[PDB]
Design an enzyme around this catalytic site. Structure first.
Site, short mmCIF file in Angstrom:
data_model
loop_
_atom_site.label_atom_id
_atom_site.label_comp_id
_atom_site.label_asym_id
_atom_site.label_seq_id
_atom_site.Cartn_x
_atom_site.Cartn_y
_atom_site.Cartn_z
N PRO A 88 -11.78 1.01 12.73
CA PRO A 88 -10.72 0.69 13.69
C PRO A 88 -9.85 -0.46 13.22
O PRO A 88 -10.34 -1.44 12.66
CB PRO A 88 -11.50 0.32 14.97
CG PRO A 88 -12.83 1.03 14.82
CD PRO A 88 -13.13 1.00 13.34
N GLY A 147 -3.93 -4.41 -0.21
CA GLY A 147 -3.87 -4.55 1.24
C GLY A 147 -4.42 -3.39 2.05
O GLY A 147 -4.07 -3.26 3.22
N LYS A 184 -17.67 -9.84 -6.12
CA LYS A 184 -16.21 -9.88 -6.27
C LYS A 184 -15.92 -10.70 -7.52
O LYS A 184 -15.82 -11.93 -7.46
CB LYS A 184 -15.54 -10.50 -5.04
CG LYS A 184 -14.03 -10.70 -5.19
CD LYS A 184 -13.23 -9.82 -4.25
CE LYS A 184 -11.72 -10.02 -4.42
NZ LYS A 184 -11.04 -8.87 -3.76
N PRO A 185 -15.81 -10.05 -8.69
CA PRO A 185 -15.72 -10.83 -9.94
C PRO A 185 -14.57 -11.81 -9.95
O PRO A 185 -14.76 -12.96 -10.35
CB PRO A 185 -15.55 -9.75 -11.01
CG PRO A 185 -16.07 -8.50 -10.40
CD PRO A 185 -15.86 -8.60 -8.92
N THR A 207 -0.25 8.13 1.47
CA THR A 207 -1.65 7.99 1.11
C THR A 207 -2.17 9.19 0.32
O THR A 207 -3.13 9.05 -0.45
CB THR A 207 -2.51 7.80 2.37
OG1 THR A 207 -3.84 7.44 1.97
CG2 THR A 207 -2.58 9.10 3.19
N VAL A 224 -13.07 -5.47 4.34
CA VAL A 224 -13.70 -5.06 5.59
C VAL A 224 -14.57 -3.81 5.35
O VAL A 224 -15.64 -3.67 5.95
CB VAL A 224 -12.64 -4.86 6.70
CG1 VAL A 224 -11.64 -3.74 6.37
CG2 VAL A 224 -13.30 -4.61 8.07
N1 LIG Z 1 18.66 -0.54 -5.43
C1 LIG Z 1 18.45 -0.04 -4.11
C2 LIG Z 1 17.17 0.65 -3.76
C3 LIG Z 1 16.95 1.17 -2.38
N2 LIG Z 1 18.00 1.01 -1.37
C4 LIG Z 1 17.78 1.48 -0.03
C5 LIG Z 1 17.99 3.07 0.15
C6 LIG Z 1 17.22 3.37 1.18
O1 LIG Z 1 17.87 3.00 2.47
C7 LIG Z 1 15.97 2.48 0.99
C8 LIG Z 1 15.00 3.14 0.18
N3 LIG Z 1 14.66 4.40 0.87
C9 LIG Z 1 13.68 4.39 1.96
O2 LIG Z 1 13.14 3.38 2.31
C10 LIG Z 1 13.35 5.76 2.68
C11 LIG Z 1 12.75 5.54 4.13
C12 LIG Z 1 11.36 6.24 4.19
N4 LIG Z 1 11.48 7.55 3.66
C13 LIG Z 1 10.18 8.15 3.20
O3 LIG Z 1 9.19 7.49 3.31
C14 LIG Z 1 10.14 9.55 2.60
C15 LIG Z 1 10.23 10.73 3.56
C16 LIG Z 1 10.60 10.39 4.77
C17 LIG Z 1 9.59 11.21 5.73
C18 LIG Z 1 8.58 11.98 4.78
C19 LIG Z 1 8.61 11.23 3.68
C20 LIG Z 1 8.27 12.00 2.42
O4 LIG Z 1 9.13 12.50 1.76
C21 LIG Z 1 6.79 12.16 2.01
C22 LIG Z 1 6.50 12.87 0.86
C23 LIG Z 1 5.17 13.04 0.50
C24 LIG Z 1 4.15 12.50 1.26
C25 LIG Z 1 2.67 12.74 0.81
C26 LIG Z 1 1.84 11.49 0.62
O5 LIG Z 1 1.19 11.01 1.58
O6 LIG Z 1 1.82 10.97 -0.52
C27 LIG Z 1 4.44 11.78 2.42
C28 LIG Z 1 5.77 11.62 2.79
C29 LIG Z 1 10.81 6.38 5.60
O7 LIG Z 1 11.26 7.30 6.35
O8 LIG Z 1 9.87 5.62 5.98
O9 LIG Z 1 16.52 1.22 0.27
C30 LIG Z 1 19.25 0.31 -1.72
O10 LIG Z 1 20.08 0.17 -0.90
N5 LIG Z 1 19.47 -0.20 -3.10
#
Ligand SMILES: Nc1ccn([C@H]2C[C@H](O)[C@@H](CNC(=O)CC[C@H](NC(=O)C[C@@H]3CCC[C@H]3C(=O)c3ccc(CC(=O)O)cc3)C(=O)O)O2)c(=O)n1
EC number: 6.3.3.3
Lengths: 226, 227
Positions: free
Chosen positions: A198, A13, A38-39, A146, A18
């Site tokens: 964009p 996704g 696009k195989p 990313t 595009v």
């Molecule tokens: N069995 C189960 C299983 C799951 N659950 C529930 C528990 C939970 O509630 C949820 C699962 N948890 C979530 O969703 C976190 C919400 C999310 N948190 C992040 O994204 C990481 C931090 C937040 C801000 C910075 C980011 C970062 O650390 C980061 C690190 C490296 C990069 C580099 C790159 O770019 O790579 C970028 C960002 C968000 O804030 O959007 O499900 C359950 O109940 N039962």
């Protein structure tokens, strides 16, 4: 031969189609002959058809595919569910090599990310890129996560000596935001960001899409591709 | 020392914190002492605090943090936004080494995925795992894209000879659709699937969470982790 680029992505996704269409449009406007392969296409029961989008957006006519599966799943799963095998490695490699010719830019669009199985047995777009000596253009997002996905994909490319032709941000949001803008800078520290398309460009008509694409890439980079 | 496991994931938001709590709870119910550390926590201005959630869900009290940054971003960007520095590699290693102990399972929770920069320059949890001789537990989803991300992650572990302790499916839906069921079967051919945690596990109370955790892992695997 000419120039073969596999067009891969950090995940599902990310807007690979595009990006293929935009690079094709930009290269055609520079006088370059473009083919897109696009195989394997999945999701056809709901009308997924990436080659048709490339035709409509960029005007490419050399549009080659081998296999179409109804279910919207990874190729191997879609093939399993239909009861039929994926194409064979030789089919994909030779189709691409037969598309290739001097003066032509040939883009190979995968399905999902770099290591998803495209052919029997367990052959990936990476394997294909080795066989045809292609470089890889990597389509990425600007969203949280990313950086890891990009780094992972570029490591996999380097490990089989497939050159990275650069990155394209498949969807650039409006307005960007703190994360998107930070990520654009951080991405450019790991590889060349060739374009950021964009958000919504997939819905453009051919004239608008052609104008966007011409502006989106560096003219000297496109022309130097072939 | 004891057993050190880094707990990484295929992306951000895969549920690493709940997996840490679940494995901690299962190991504790088997009589294993458990410590959890979080070398880099971003998003503190949002209230993100994975160590405190592990404490809430599992009762773990041996919790160790090091770097904390307010913005919910990658560590490098969060640290730059705050005018702060990332920890040095040796600081993360010291945090972990201080917790390691015979008979103890020490879990090292990453931030985002495996190759996220945690220390200058470009030091990742993969480098840390090499430094402390840890194996890596990989938290994955059952969603479209998981097979590619899982294989990319394991390939990167192998490139530095970091052993993979297995996969955990962080959230397993009930009932599973076709994609989720196909992915679980394919994941199990890539690597040993150690557990698949029921979706919504983070909303179970202490007792329900404890029962879920005990059911979710093979007791022989858990017990085998630590002599
Ligand atoms: N069995 C189960 C299983 C799951 N659950 C529930 C528990 C939970 O509630 C949820 C699962 N948890 C979530 O969703 C976190 C919400 C999310 N948190 C992040 O994204 C990481 C931090 C937040 C801000 C910075 C980011 C970062 O650390 C980061 C690190 C490296 C990069 C580099 C790159 O770019 O790579 C970028 C960002 C968000 O804030 O959007 O499900 C359950 O109940 N039962």
């Amino acid at each position: 031969g000419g120039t073969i680029l596999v067009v891969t992505g950090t995940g599902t996704g990310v807007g690979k189609t595009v990006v293929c269409a935009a690079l094709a449009s930009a290269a055609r406007q520079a006088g370059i002959d473009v083919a897109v392969c696009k195989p394997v296409q999945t999701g056809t029961a709901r009308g997924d058809d990436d080659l048709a989008e490339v035709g409509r957006l960029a005007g490419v006519t050399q549009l080659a595919g081998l296999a179409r599966y109804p279910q919207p799943m990874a190729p191997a799963a879609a093939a399993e569910h239909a009861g039929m095998a994926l194409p064979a490695r030789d089919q994909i490699v030779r189709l691409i090599a037969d598309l290739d010719r001097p003066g032509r830019l040939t883009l190979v669009e995968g399905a999902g990310g770099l290591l998803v199985e495209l052919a029997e047995p367990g052959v990936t777009l990476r394997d294909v890129a080795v066989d045809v000596a292609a470089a890889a253009l990597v389509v990425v997002t600007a969203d949280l996560g990313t950086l890891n996905h990009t780094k992972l994909t570029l490591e996999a490319l380097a490990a089989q000596q497939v050159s990275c032709a650069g990155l394209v941000i498949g969807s650039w949001p409006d307005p960007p935001g703190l994360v998107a803008a930070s990520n654009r800078s951080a991405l450019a520290r790991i590889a060349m960001v060739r374009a950021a398309l964009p958000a919504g460009a997939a819905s453009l008509d051919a004239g608008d899409f052609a104008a966007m694409s011409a502006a989106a890439f560096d003219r000297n980079w496109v022309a130097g591709l072939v």
